[PDB]
Design an enzyme around this catalytic site. Sequence first.
Site, PDB file in Angstrom:
ATOM      1  N   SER A  92       0.894  -1.011  -0.138  1.00  0.00           N
ATOM      2  CA  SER A  92       0.281  -0.122   0.384  1.00  0.00           C
ATOM      3  C   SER A  92       0.784   0.904  -0.019  1.00  0.00           C
ATOM      4  O   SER A  92       1.905   1.466   0.701  1.00  0.00           O
ATOM      5  CB  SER A  92      -1.555   0.197   1.225  1.00  0.00           C
ATOM      6  N   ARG A  93       0.280   2.052  -0.837  1.00  0.00           N
ATOM      7  CA  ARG A  93       1.225   3.536  -0.702  1.00  0.00           C
ATOM      8  C   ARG A  93       1.432   4.421  -0.373  1.00  0.00           C
ATOM      9  O   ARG A  93       2.204   5.317   0.746  1.00  0.00           O
ATOM     10  CB  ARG A  93       1.016   3.469  -2.522  1.00  0.00           C
ATOM     11  N   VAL A  94       0.123   4.757   0.579  1.00  0.00           N
ATOM     12  CA  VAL A  94      -0.397   5.708   1.214  1.00  0.00           C
ATOM     13  C   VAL A  94      -0.383   4.843   2.559  1.00  0.00           C
ATOM     14  O   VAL A  94      -1.545   5.897   4.110  1.00  0.00           O
ATOM     15  CB  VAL A  94      -1.032   6.887   1.240  1.00  0.00           C
TER      16      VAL A  94
END
Lengths: 171, 363, 52
Positions: free
Chosen positions: B228-230
């Site tokens: 997951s990126r944020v």
Amino acid sequence: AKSAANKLDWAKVISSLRITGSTATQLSSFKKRNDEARRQLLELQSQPTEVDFSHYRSVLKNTSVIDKIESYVKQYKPVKIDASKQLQVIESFEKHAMTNAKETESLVSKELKDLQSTLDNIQSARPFDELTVDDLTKIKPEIDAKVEEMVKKGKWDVPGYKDRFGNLNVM
Amino acid sequence: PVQTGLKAVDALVPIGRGQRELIIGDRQTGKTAVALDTILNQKRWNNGSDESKKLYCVYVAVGQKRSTVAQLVQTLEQHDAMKYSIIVAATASEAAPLQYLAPFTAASIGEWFRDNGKHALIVYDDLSKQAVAYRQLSLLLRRPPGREAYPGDVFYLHSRLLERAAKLSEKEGSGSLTALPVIETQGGDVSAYIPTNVISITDGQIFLEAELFYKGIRPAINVGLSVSRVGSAAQVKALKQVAGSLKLFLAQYREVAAFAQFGSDLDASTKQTLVRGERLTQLLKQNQYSPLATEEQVPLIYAGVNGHLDGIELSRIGEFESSFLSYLKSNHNELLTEIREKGELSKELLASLKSATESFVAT
Amino acid sequence: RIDSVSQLQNVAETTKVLFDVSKETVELESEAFELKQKVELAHEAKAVLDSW
Ligand SMILES: Nc1ncnc2c1ncn2[C@@H]1O[C@H](COP(=O)(O)OP(=O)(O)OP(=O)(O)O)[C@@H](O)[C@H]1O
């Protein structure tokens, strides 16, 4: 305030390290773990043990039974009491336990200072290159008893001797 | 944070309020169960009183059977989720522009909760049947198909759907909308034309690989793919303190995955990491309908990280979970309240937790 | 032998407290048993009134 009980139980766990092969003592703590883990989910699981007569009785428009089973719950509102009946038998078990405990506690307190006294006697009384065998006969009549029985039977061989003490002879 | 209540999700791939995360997977491989467990985990705050911690769930079943949505409503009324659920059903008996429309109308339902300050989770399930309905509506109007016969604007469809979900700032009322679309791939594929458009919108994947569910490890998150990126900027502070090794440690264990299949005798370090990695893989299992709150996700992962499990055989770990949890529920309840209130492990909290581990680890 | 003596030094003093407090934590939960009776009757009432 249950953490004092469980802290002293793990204190006895790291002290029951000293007695390997615990039969049912940890199983007794397993049984208190069983019902103590049971009682917390039992008290958190329940609702307020009552029929909600404000909302949940006004739901049923054709009511006819909610006052009936409401009165049935308020009938059994003195539900059933527990038992702290043990005031005769549990005092007997702690009496036997405290008796054995004080006996062991005073016994090891005696035996520690007795071995400390034996250590202090051992430090100052080793005349190891100059002790007389007459003093060994004086401290042990087992010496003369075994020697005299050994001559009377005639087992002039001293068994268990040649290993740590050499035969030292020519042949 | 959006505390999903699963162990591995909040361990590895955390979800922020306003972070569009994708649950991608295969057929009958445990895709719906993640979203259903997240909706059932939000019972921790939907019973509560603060609005900004409540989290309303809108589950949007498209293309599924009638009876599946019936059982899912029955499930969300067993565990009492229906005081905050919104079901938008577009079942596969009904015709195609209903399925083309229904996730959009549910996104309008989500935006109503978004503009009005409250926080709300939405679950699209599953948009690989929405693109089926859209290729039906664009292959009955003579519009010419593109790659793999989804019509050329099918990127734009999932775009204009998922972009109505983010975190509004304080200027609009600090509301939010968070989306979990579900994509049914074909046999572990991540490179058809549809799952390479949902991935290029959402902020990350939870790739529920079929092979791990075939070994029963449910939920079957492939750790080395799911990212997951944020997520990392919005995890609970406690898990971020006691799982900063865990992603890198599972990467380490995945490095020696195919190296240990040779059966060759090895050094000590790979055996240590192999035992701890197997204990962590067996550790992240979870039964259905039992989400664990973060106040209980911290000590289990904490027992996993710092080598305390290494004396236990591998089969006892499943009952070790419930045993160590009931050990903390009966005795060290104040530590769970500390993790609940503070959400963070200070040094004293850490030392008390290490004592409370090594106690129960010792037997 | 001094070590095996010294392990059992303060132990009886602690297990005369272990005994009592452990058996108290065992047997102060039949309270919760008779709580469970009140729980399960109300659960049955809630079940039948949900049926109504
Ligand atoms: N934690 C779990 N415990 C028990 N069973 C599970 C768990 N996770 C998944 N399953 C099993 O997975 C099966 C399918 O679940 P799920 O609906 O999530 O798969 P799916 O791929 O989403 O199916 P569909 O795509 O048709 O909805 C269920 O039968 C369920 O029993």
